[PDB]
Design a protein around this ligand. Structure first.
Ligand SMILES: Nc1ncnc2c1ncn2[C@@H]1O[C@H](COP(=O)(O)OP(=O)(O)OP(=O)(O)O)[C@@H](O)[C@H]1O
Ligand SMILES: Nc1ncnc2c1ncn2[C@@H]1O[C@H](COP(=O)(O)OP(=O)(O)OP(=O)(O)O)[C@@H](O)[C@H]1O
Ligand SMILES: Nc1ncnc2c1ncn2[C@@H]1O[C@H](COP(=O)(O)OP(=O)(O)OP(=O)(O)O)[C@@H](O)[C@H]1O
Ligand SMILES: [Mg+2]
Ligand SMILES: [Mg+2]
Lengths: 113, 483, 383, 434, 380, 156
């Protein structure tokens, strides 16, 4: 298999998700749909305290945490890249990496132009 | 001249983590915007680890770090002679800038196999315990290992002071220019050595590279390499050098501080894994070059402090492996009145008699043999068992010989005088003398014996048969105390 | 990913809200169907993230003071040692097998304290002041902190008054001032407690002959001792009459190491009631070498770096801040005193050990008990 | 309800989506070749517990079902465990069917509280002359047995089991903590022939329960097998109301096994490589061996000294709990003296005149004085002569030699292979006899 | 601000990107079909190095199960962690790369046991290294078996004759006991163990078939020159007709030297379990513990007193307790062990030396001071 | 042990040719207990151990005559006239070391002239193991000697 190359290389474990997020969004030509759907989720944590409880609180079960994000990302604004990332970040409890994976998405987007 | 910029992420304990500076080299001098310098040591994927050449109090989070483009360098040349510099080049004696000098790197590859020749000419210490038993050639690294106050510094200072006495009598080519690197020492202590070296006159040929205890740990780690780079100017241009790293034991402790704070994993005694490479990189730059490369030499004297005579120490075992010889100084020999307190049974010279005075190669051969016979017979008369009268002869003669090797701390004897002194003790001429006044008997043996018989032994370098009889016929026309 | 780049994510930069408003009408219906699987959220209470090695990591507790008594819902006390950004690590004064992940941690609002007063006189308490003698709660008493700072230079005077031990070798050759610390150091089985028990029995004989201000109220602290020895000692004090003036703080060998680490501070706080009210105290820390072993356990389980003998490095400050509270106070502070007798167990006569040499450089003198004079029948075996 | 998360050697992580088991609770791995029992060591966070296995973890899969028992390791206790061999988790190893259990008791238990403790400090009469006079046994105390091989330690174990059952009416538990299986079988067959363990229909007349954790068992199974021996002895103490003997064979191997489970759980080792909790892992065992108002447990614990070093932290922590030492010597055994208790090296804390009285004290203080004066002149007999020394100094030699002989005693459990009958010697007949 | 709770994240998995990649690349319109990584009975190598492969996947692997890499090099699943498997490699890890496929074989570690193993020189996993073809008359058996319990054993009574007069008079050794041959270097350790194997060749031709004793020599950490010198000696005397040699030499991987005493014991447990008598000799038990300390420090298990694993007592006791004398209802067979521990400067206070002294019944101490005095065997 | 074992197991005599290897091994503080020399000991066929106490006595080459061990010292390899001389020299040098505990305390007067003869025999044997090297002519000052194998067995 072969993916597009990221424009600039980055560090790991949060900037390594943003590199892979950029690569599947450059293959699907969704480099600004997936980018702007990230910026909506930066805002969505500021509005709803129960959405950011699914990223900071360690006592929410992982069965609950993956069945809220899958059951609110339906039927509107899917894009199959934001939808599949945020069930992966909710399976591992890495939803608090969403601020840090967005910043490294912008450095890949700015170097794309 | 595009300058790459790095933002400081965090600064603590003299170490600053810097974001950016992707272009920076490993071991590159960086510049903080507070004016304080730095060195990029571990280039990690997310940040750069910078050891700070100075006080890290002026560095804040988010300060701008500029790279200077250059690996760490020091001013080398003849303009460094006479000056007291700090850990990397800069003079601290208050005498202005270093004029007539040139900036060269402090981490140079040591000269390889095809750039050497055999260490054949001697470097006279002036200490007759050294120049007879453990003699040192030009291009040989010799360890002065000892206890906390065993006179290790005195042996090294007497090598520097004696070179001034030799440099006034030799031609311009075979003059030895000394460098004294003081690592982790007191600044008062360093100032007593510059005071001694200007009073002696040794400061004309001496560079004093001072990384005191107040200095940052990367300034004391780096000061042996910066002093060796100043000393390698004379080696590379055909002249002869003499580098003394006083307390390489204190350089390894300053290197353990940076390694532990750059998060490098600790080894034996919380020391870095490459500590051996710390001292073998440095001491292998002391070489005798070939005549294609000028014929110049650099003679090293590392100083290692042991704890309780524990030469089985991690850093002590490393430097005994690197160096050629070894001058082991013992505490109980120091207080028995034997000064310098050299353990003759443990002090070796791997170059050996190939690079020593020929006028003492034949005289001090029986000296170290009669002292080898003196050692085991003194262990048995320690109890008080019995006597043999041939055991008591070597127990009595070696007591003259041990008393003969004693020397004043600030006076270094010339090689011609030492051979005459050892001749008068090994040819029996200092028998019929009490064992107590041999420290004062040999002032007669140097003064009353003719001042023109030292000139023949200096010019020939060897007691000829026309001089071997003439001076033993003058070692009878002398008046000794008591007699 | 610099900090200048992440605070740009504070201000909105989407200009497109097609799933901000989509999930906002579906989030609250999604949360509502998973409500019996949510534990109730926790801000000023605490919830245990992780418990083990006698240290609990507690989520929440937004307003705990450092070093504060926290109470688990199992009824067990803890002390908030390190407040961190994400959790607060407490050390459990008791058995950690009854604490689970998910348990509520409550705040008592008070830094760790023990009951002090006249009503704690006569009683056998644990390392936290809870009485284990079975004869009820502590009445006529009030709470005081166990980590009070020692009085300074100007709050002290020199020791003048002679505090008789009743031991012939002690009161003749190494006599004890009344605000003094005296180490009782020796090997195992050398009459270490015997010298400290005879000091306590002797004050019962003297308290009934002195006019109410020269009375010495003893406190005995047992750290790492077997319960049977402690119970055999309360029987001896009750039958000699010495229990009327004695408090008995007990943290035995089965107790948790934070209860044995805290028991000399708990007992010092109870003995500081008499120092601070013009009366005179006597405290015995029997096996302060066992209190350092209990503190070595808590420091190694907190993964603090080992030391010279694997001790935390602050094990000097463990005993120095303890024994500095045994002072002779000045006349404007009442003139009260507190006399300490720490006990250090020595291995094979070696007094050059780490904890032995620490307490020697804290205390004012030593009572060396030789194990060769003890075998010859010379008892007390005073070196 | 829980599933296996990690398997790192003997340390298993189990993940529970519901509520976690308590620390020290028992977990059974649902579906395995052997019955695998885990004991919860800590709550790691993220709904994971860390466990130490009582058996081998080979063949364990991540995702295997683990059933929480809601309790610690529960073992059969009662008179039906007498004469049986039991392992740490309570299963019969002796291959004689199931264990007829009076009750099933948790092996984890706090020590008896302060009001439950006994303040009296009396003497446990053993019927052996040398350990009733010179080193008396405290009822409820801990006794170090410094034996070995061929000093008759096993005959001394079975005689202590015999005389406590015969006179004081209490039973015995043997906790073989980390024993070799050849030596644990040699003890079982020696107890069968000497009558302290019976097999078959006469099983109820046996006096000792064997609780065995062998050397090939994992370090968690050896670290808890002394607590299984406590719990059998605690049923006889607290329900049957008896004066129980306990034999923690090699208390050092209890320390050594608990030091291995601390190292496997990632804890930083203490001075000399021991666990930071060595004082409290050892003291948690030894504080349940005490006298209560119901009965008592007296433990005779074999003590190994590691590098012939009494200042090592494993004997030094152990000796703080010990109330008597019985040293068995080969030098006493080469003189034909059985039992081989050294009359001078053996010590007791019960030997002062405030618990045993001045009559018993001065006899034992007088007996020990005579043999001390006899055995420091044995380097002036061989080089000067036997008839050389004075009539008073040889009066002690004649008196000590008929005391050194009189510390011998024939044992009732040894009469099936020695012919001579055994003799229980009372305490008053020992003081007046000496 | 209300977004400061998400400023720094924390992850409970180091390999979070290998789970994210298993949900993002199958969401591309092309790679929804035919491109999805199998994880249950297969695995991917994450990290290689020093004979350890960290392997993502292998969800249904067992602890201690033998796995196979796609290059044919085998391995043992030794750490089973929440996101990966730590695999100790049974060869050189140079042929293994990041992203290689790891297949589980379903089997825990096996060796051929039986009468076909007699006369053959095998490696630490049972494969023959003398070049005489495959093991023919054998069957597969497990490597780490439970030692026999209390009731399966009986008392050690029958003598095992070493042929050494210092041993057979002073330190008598019975069929079913385990005796430590402990000493310094070149003190005659092997001299005592080879004399035992040679003497059973003499004794076997003069006793009935039920009383013959079959030897197994396990050479751990020795060189191939010394092992080949010992096959040549065993063939010249004729002792190879009763001897198996399990040889995990110095160039072999540390998992081979760790598993070779267990592989030789399982070959020797065949004779014990079928009523015959065995003699298992471990040339260097100390060498085996050095190889096991290598895998545990590299699997990042917590280090002990000499950086050894906590179960390193459980390493040697579980091995040495398999040397038993069985009861009459289990055939009455036996297995006699001779572990060899090399001390340095003759101290038995060393960590591994104190462990094996505890496990074994006796010890044969060989002193180098008596070795230069003419005494041979220098038995203390 | 496995980095060292991977290197040494290549230095072997094969059926194609033969590599005769001579490896110096540094021991760190005159310490053969140290694990880097102690791992090397199991790899070699002849371990010439040099000692500081032989070097301080002036005997050069400073070979420890007891601690040096070879696999060529079997009697069925080098014959019996070489094995018994080597086993006899090692016996006299070991007896002298057990006597030198009492010589350095008392002084060689109470050995009943059986042990006084083996002190003087070992002292001759100790110096007769010393030999001038052809490469130490610049050090020792004497021309080097090549001693044949027959002249060594005949001399000792
Ligand atoms: N040969 C000597 N005769 C007399 N005094 C001497 C001699 N050598 C040294 N001393 C004196 O002994 C003391 C210790 O010597 P010195 O300071 O040179 O030792 P050192 O090994 O450098 O110790 P330090 O650890 O202080 O650096 C000094 O006062 C020095 O002058
Ligand atoms: N003066 C004395 N005369 C006689 N016996 C004494 C005397 N002092 C103490 N003893 C006894 O000696 C033994 C040991 O004394 P004690 O228990 O006081 O010592 P310790 O230092 O507390 O020992 P441990 O380490 O066991 O706590 C006890 O049996 C005690 O009763
Ligand atoms: N009884 C003996 N008589 C004579 N030589 C012997 C005797 N036992 C052993 N040797 C010799 O001693 C030398 C070393 O002994 P050996 O190699 O058997 O012992 P080892 O402890 O296994 O040594 P290593 O440390 O090399 O493994 C060999 O040359 C061997 O032949
Ligand atoms: Mg006490
Ligand atoms: Mg061998």
């Amino acid at each position: 298999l072969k993916l597009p190359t990221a424009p600039l290389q980055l560090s790991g474990t949060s900037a390594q998700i943003a590199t892979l997020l950029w690569q599947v969004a450059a293959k699907e030509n969704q480099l600004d749909k997936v980018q702007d759907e990230l910026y909506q989720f930066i805002e969505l944590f500021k509005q709803h305290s129960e959405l950011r409880r699914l990223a900071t609180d360690p006592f929410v079960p992982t069965l609950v945490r993956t069945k809220i994000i899958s059951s609110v990302l339906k039927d509107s604004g899917a894009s199959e890249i934001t939808k599949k990332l945020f069930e992966a970040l909710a399976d591992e409890g890495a939803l608090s990496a969403l601020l840090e994976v967005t910043v490294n998405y912008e450095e890949l987007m700015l170097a794309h132009k | 001249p595009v300058i790459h910029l790095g933002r400081v992420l965090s600064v603590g304990d003299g170490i600053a983590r810097v974001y950016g500076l992707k272009s920076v080299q490993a071991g590159e001098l960086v510049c903080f915007d507070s004016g304080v310098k730095g060195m990029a040591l571990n280039l990690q994927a997310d940040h750069v680890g910078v050891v700070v050449f100075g006080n890290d109090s002026v560095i804040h989070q988010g300060d701008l770090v500029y790279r200077t483009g250059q690996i760490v360098n020091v001013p080398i040349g003849p303009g460094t002679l006479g000056r007291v510099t700090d850990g990397l080049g800069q003079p601290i004696d208050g005498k202005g800038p270093l004029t007539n000098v040139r900036s060269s790197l402090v981490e140079v590859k040591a000269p390889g196999i095809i750039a050497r020749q055999s260490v054949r000419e001697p470097l006279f210490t002036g200490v007759k315990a050294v120049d007879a038993l453990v003699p040192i050639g030009r291009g040989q690294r010799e360890l002065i290992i000892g206890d906390r106050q065993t006179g290790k510094t005195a042996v090294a200072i007497d090598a520097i002071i004696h070179q001034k006495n030799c440099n006034e009598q030799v031609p311009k080519a075979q003059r030895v220019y000394c460098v004294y690197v003081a690592v982790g020492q007191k600044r008062s202590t360093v100032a007593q050595l510059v005071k001694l070296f200007t009073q002696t006159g040794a400061m004309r040929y001496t560079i004093m590279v001072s990384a005191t205890a107040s200095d940052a740990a990367p300034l004391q780690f780096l000061a042996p390499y910066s002093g060796c780079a100043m000393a390698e100017y004379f080696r590379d241009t055909g002249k002869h050098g003499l580098i003394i790293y006083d307390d390489l034991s204190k350089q390894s402790v300053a290197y353990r501080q940076m390694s532990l704070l750059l998060r490098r994993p600790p080894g034996r005694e919380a020391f870095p894994g490459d500590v051996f490479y710390l001292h073998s990189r440095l001491l292998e730059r002391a070489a005798k070059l070939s005549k294609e490369l000028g014929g110049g030499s650099l003679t090293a004297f590392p100083v290692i402090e042991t704890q309780a005579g524990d030469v089985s120490a991690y850093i002590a075992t490393n430097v005994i492996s690197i160096t050629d010889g070894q001058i082991f100084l013992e505490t109980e020999l120091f207080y028995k009145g034997i000064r310098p307190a050299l353990n003759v049974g443990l002090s070796v010279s791997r170059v050996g008699s190939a690079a020593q005075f020929p006028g003492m190669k034949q005289v001090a051969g029986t000296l170290k043999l009669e002292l080898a016979q003196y050692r085991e017979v003194a262990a048995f008369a320690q109890f008080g068992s019995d006597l043999d009268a041939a055991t008591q002869y070597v127990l009595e003669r070696g007591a003259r010989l041990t008393e003969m090797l004693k020397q004043k701390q600030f006076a270094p004897i010339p090689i011609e005088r030492q051979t005459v002194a050892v001749y008068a003790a090994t040819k029996g001429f200092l028998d019929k003398v009490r064992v107590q006044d041999i420290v004062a008997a040999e002032e007669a043996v140097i003064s009353q014996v003719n001042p023109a018989v030292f000139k023949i032994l200096k010019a020939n370098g060897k007691i000829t048969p026309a001089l071997d009889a003439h001076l033993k016929a003058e070692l009878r026309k002398v008046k000794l105390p008591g007699a | 990913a610099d900090a200048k780049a992440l605070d740009e994510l504070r201000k909105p930069k989407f200009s497109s809200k097609y799933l901000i408003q989509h999930v906002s009408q579906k989030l609250i219906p999604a949360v509502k169907e998973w409500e019996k699987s949510y534990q109730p959220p926790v801000i000023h209470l605490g919830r245990v993230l992780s418990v083990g090695d006698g240290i609990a990591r507690v989520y929440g507790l937004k307003s705990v003071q450092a070093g504060e008594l926290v109470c688990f819902d199992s009824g067990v006390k803890g002390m908030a040692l390190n407040l961190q950004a994400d959790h607060v690590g407490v050390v459990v004064f008791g058995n950690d097998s009854v604490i689970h992940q998910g348990d509520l941690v409550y705040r008592t609002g008070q830094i760790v304290n023990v009951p002090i007063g006249p009503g704690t006189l006569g009683r056998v308490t644990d390392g936290l002041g809870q009485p284990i003698d079975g004869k009820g709660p502590l009445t006529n008493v009030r709470s005081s902190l166990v980590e009070v700072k020692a009085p300074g230079i100007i709050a002290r005077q020199s020791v003048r008054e002679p505090l008789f031990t009743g031991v012939k070798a002690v009161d003749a050759l190494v006599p004890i001032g009344r605000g003094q610390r005296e180490l009782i150091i020796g090997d195992r089985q050398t009459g270490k407690t015997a010298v400290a028990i005879d000091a306590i029995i002797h004050q019962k004989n003297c308290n009934e002959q002195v006019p109410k201000a020269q009375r010495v109220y003893c406190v005995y602290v047992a750290v790492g001792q077997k319960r049977s020895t402690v119970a055999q000692l309360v029987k001896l004090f009750t039958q000699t009459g010495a229990m009327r003036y004695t408090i008995m703080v007990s943290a035995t060998a089965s107790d948790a190491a934070p209860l044995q680490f805290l028991a000399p501070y708990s007992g010092c706080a109870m003995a500081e009631y008499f120092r601070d009210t013009g009366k005179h105290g006597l405290i015995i820390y029997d096996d302060l070498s066992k209190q350092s072993v209990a503190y070595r356990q808590m420091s190694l389980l907190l993964r603090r770096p080992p030391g010279r003998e694997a001790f935390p490095g602050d094990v000097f400050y463990l005993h120095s801040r303890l024994l500095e509270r045994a002072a002779k106070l000045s006349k404007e502070l009442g003139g009260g005193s507190l006399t300490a007798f720490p006990v250090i167990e020595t291995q094979a006569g070696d007094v050059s050990a780490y904890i032995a040499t620490n307490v020697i450089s804290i205390t004012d003198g030593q009572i060396f008990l030789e194990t060769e004079l003890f075998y010859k029948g010379i008892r007390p075996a005073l070196n | 309800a829980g599933y296996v998360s990690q398997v790192i050697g003997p340390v298993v992580d189990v993940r529970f989506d519901g509520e976690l088991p308590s620390i020290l609770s028992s977990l059974e791995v649902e579906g395995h070749s052997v019955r695998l029992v885990l004991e919860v060591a800590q709550h790691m966070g993220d709904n994971t517990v860390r466990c130490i296995a009582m058996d081998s973890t080979d063949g364990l899969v991540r995702g295997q079902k683990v059933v929480d028992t809601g309790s610690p390791i529960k073992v059969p206790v009662g008179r039906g465990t007498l004469g049986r061999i039991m392992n740490v988790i309570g299963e019969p190893v002796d291959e004689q069917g199931p264990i007829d259990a009076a009750d099933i008791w948790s092996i984890h238990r706090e020590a008896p509280e302060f009001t439950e403790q006994s303040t009296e400090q009396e003497i446990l009469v053993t019927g052996i002359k040398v350990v009733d006079l010179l080193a008396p046994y405290q009822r409820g105390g801990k006794i170090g047995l410094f034996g070995g091989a061929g000093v008759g330690k096993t005959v001394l174990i079975m005689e202590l089991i015999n005389n406590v059952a015969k006179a004081h009416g209490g039973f015995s538990v043997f906790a073989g903590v980390g024993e070799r299986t050849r030596e644990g079988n040699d003890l079982y067959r020696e107890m069968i022939e000497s009558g302290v363990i019976k097999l078959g229909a006469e099983r109820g007349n046996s006096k000792c329960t064997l609780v065995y954790g062998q050397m090939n068992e994992p370090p968690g199974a050896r670290a808890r097998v002394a607590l299984t021996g406590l719990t059998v002895a605690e049923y006889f103490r607290d329900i049957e109301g008896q004066d129980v003997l306990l034999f923690v064979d090699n208390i050092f191997r209890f320390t050594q096994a608990n030091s291995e489970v601390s190292a496997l759980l990632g804890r930083i080792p203490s001075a000399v490589g021991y666990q930071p909790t060595l004082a409290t892992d050892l003291g948690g065992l030894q504080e349940r061996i005490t006298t209560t108002t119901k009965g008592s447990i007296t433990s005779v614990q074999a003590v190994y000294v590691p590098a012939d070093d009494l200042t090592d932290p494993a004997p030094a922590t152990t000796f703080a709990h010990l109330d008597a030492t019985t040293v068995l010597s080969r030098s006493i055994a080469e003189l034909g003296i059985y039992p081989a208790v050294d009359p001078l090296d053996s010590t007791s804390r019960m030997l002062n005149p405030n618990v045993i009285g001045a009559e018993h004290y001065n006899v034992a203080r007088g007996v020990q004085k005579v043999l001390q004066d006899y055995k420091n002149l044995q380097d002036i007999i061989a080089i000067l002569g036997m008839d050389e020394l004075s009539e008073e100094d040889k009066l002690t030699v004649a008196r000590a030699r008929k005391i050194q002989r009189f510390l011998s005693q024939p044992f009732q459990v040894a009469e099936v292979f020695t012919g001579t009958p055994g003799k229980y010697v009372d305490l008053a007949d020992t003081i007046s006899g000496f």
